[PDB]
Amino acid sequence: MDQETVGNVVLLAIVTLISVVQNGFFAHKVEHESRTQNGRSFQRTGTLAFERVYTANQNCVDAYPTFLAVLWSAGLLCSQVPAAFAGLMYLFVRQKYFVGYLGERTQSTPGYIFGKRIILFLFLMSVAGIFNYYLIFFFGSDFENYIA
Amino acid sequence: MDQETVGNVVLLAIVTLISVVQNGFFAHKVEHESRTQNGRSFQRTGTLAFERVYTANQNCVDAYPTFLAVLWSAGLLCSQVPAAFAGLMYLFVRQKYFVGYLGERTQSTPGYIFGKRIILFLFLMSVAGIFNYYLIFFFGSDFENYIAT
Amino acid sequence: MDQETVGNVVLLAIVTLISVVQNGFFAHKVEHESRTQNGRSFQRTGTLAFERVYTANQNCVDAYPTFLAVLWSAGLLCSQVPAAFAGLMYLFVRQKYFVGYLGERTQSTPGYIFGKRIILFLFLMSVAGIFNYYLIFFFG
Ligand SMILES: CC(C)(C)CC(=O)c1c(CC(C)(C)C(=O)O)n(Cc2ccc(I)cc2)c2ccc(OCc3ccc4ccccc4n3)cc12
Ligand SMILES: CC(C)(C)CC(=O)c1c(CC(C)(C)C(=O)O)n(Cc2ccc(I)cc2)c2ccc(OCc3ccc4ccccc4n3)cc12
Ligand SMILES: CC(C)(C)CC(=O)c1c(CC(C)(C)C(=O)O)n(Cc2ccc(I)cc2)c2ccc(OCc3ccc4ccccc4n3)cc12
Predict the structure, then answer these.
(1) Cβ of C120 less than 6 Å from ligand 3
(2) Lumenal side: which ranges (chain B)?
(3) I need a labelling partner for B110 at 20 to 30 A (CA). Which of A82, B38, C27, C130 fits?
(4) Quick check: CB of B63 below 6 Å from ligand 3?
């Protein structure tokens, strides 16, 4: 990748690598519970600390794709820096969500969803440029300067 | 993103944005179930509609990646319009599947497959340009005006 | 896609197409168990052969995203080949893992963590160029 382009994406790469790392921790806190006992042959059903964890993780796993989607499409189709930061904030809400899904009873982060607004915004940033592009395509050109 | 390039991808972006929205609906019809499922937290096995819902949705979740894969690779390596439409059609089959899952509790429908030929095609388009490239790489530069004596 | 660029990604595309195919196989060996025994909703402890399969598969399904992530970012921020080969190696570990999660009466191979170093490496490749870029940005 030519140093130039690499610039207009760096942040997105960064934030992505971050989520990639955090993504591992989530998948790590799940290994622990699998370990805490019978886990020998990674059984999915140890209850409690394992069920609450696998759930919390298997919830953020279903988000990642759809998140990354907006994350990049928004940052490319328009802005980047804003998209890049929004994506960072997501990483935090994700943390707070995953964490809040710990246990100790009580309706623990019952929500399957979470980011919402964050991806909603990222989606708009994408639906933004996606449209503004269609302009620069018609009225962006046109501008016939028949300088006869 | 230079207005030019943005063009040869717009549809892909569009279709993707679509799937992204629909994707939310899927994860929303799942939130309703855990809600109506009067209880505290959120668990993998509850009730009938919830069980059926989470399954349906958690089936399309395993799809998206492998689908987005071909969607783009097909749209980049071989014509963006045909790729974009394929993915579009795919979004529809998805709807019909997700909807048909648990809505009828009938003996047609279930499965963890959904659109097969839709991604197969997308795959081919990728395996298409991917090969035709090796021609442009190898032969695409071969001309015998060098036999010119 | 201009022939030039297509070059600096073909490997990634290829390997990606592979994992996409293998990805189908995994989801296929899951179809085999489901259709025989019953289950319109596959969320409860299924027949062993089926429970083992869906778990194995629904285990690589959580990987793919985070994998593809490093696969590309590493193959882009850091040169093509190695990143590509890395991902290729991963596809193999995947196979062995998924396969090792098959059997019957065998000590099944757990730790949903599969290919720790593989993606660790790919991650570094990314964190690599990601930094080296900041240099060329300042000290160029
Ligand atoms: C990220 C890294 C730089 C490449 C290092 C890395 O190699 C990975 C690590 C770090 C750790 C402890 C294994 C290590 O390097 O020592 N863990 C555990 C960890 C420990 C502390 C912290 I804070 C965060 C994570 C990983 C866990 C998973 C992983 O990929 C594979 C993988 C497979 C399935 C996944 C499912 C859901 C979701 C993700 C899934 N991922 C790589 C690593
Ligand atoms: C899509 C949008 C334009 C960015 C708006 C948006 O921000 C989200 C919406 C729409 C919303 C909030 C305005 C609403 O519910 O009314 N819902 C609920 C909704 C309502 C109507 C319809 I038709 C479809 C979905 C969302 C649900 C989830 C979401 O992200 C996070 C998320 C987390 C996990 C996911 C797992 C699988 C799959 C996806 C996962 N997503 C964003 C939104
Ligand atoms: C060219 C192509 C990309 C392989 C497309 C394709 O054609 C698909 C195939 C192969 C096929 C059509 C010859 C078949 O046997 O049915 N199968 C079954 C198969 C047969 C032999 C072997 I080895 C491997 C898989 C598919 C199964 C699912 C599929 O949708 C994508 C998909 C769907 C659900 C998934 C769930 C989890 C995780 C990933 C998921 N992915 C496409 C195909």
Answers:
(1) no
(2) 1-8, 78-80, 129-149
(3) B38
(4) yes
Cβ neighbours of B12 (radius 10 Å): 21
Q: Tell me whether residue B30 is exposed, middle or buried, using C-beta atoms within 10 angstroms of its C-beta: 0 to 12, 13 to 18, 19 or more.
A: buried
Method: X-ray
What percent of the residues of chain C are helix, what percent strand, and what percent coil, each to the nearest 5? 75, 0, 25
* Domain span at C62: 2-140
Task: Please count the structural domains in chain B.
Answer: 1
Find chains touching chain B: ≥3 CB pairs under 8 Å. Answer: A, C
Distance from Cα C32 to the centre of ligand 3, integer Å: 13
Contacting partners of chain C (3+ CB pairs under 8 A)? A, B
DSSP A48: G
Nearest to C70 among A7, A20, A39 (CB): A20
Q: Which distant-in-sequence residues (6+ apart) come within 8 Å of C40 by Cβ?
A: B52, B102, B105, B110
The span from the CA of A89 to the CA of A83, in Å, is: 10
Closest CA to B76 of B30, B11, B146, B136: B11
* CATH code where residue B147 lies: 1.20.120.550
- Say which of A10, A41, A61 has its CB closest to residue C108: A41
Chain C interface includes A40 (CB < 8 A): yes
| Nearest CA-CA partner of A126 in B6, C140, B46, B111 | B6
Q: Are B40 and A110 in contact (CB under 8 A)?
A: yes
Distance, in Å, from the CA atom of A92 to the CA atom of C65, rounded to the nearest integer, reads 19
Q: How far from the centroid of its chain's Cα atoms is residue C83's Cα?
A: 13
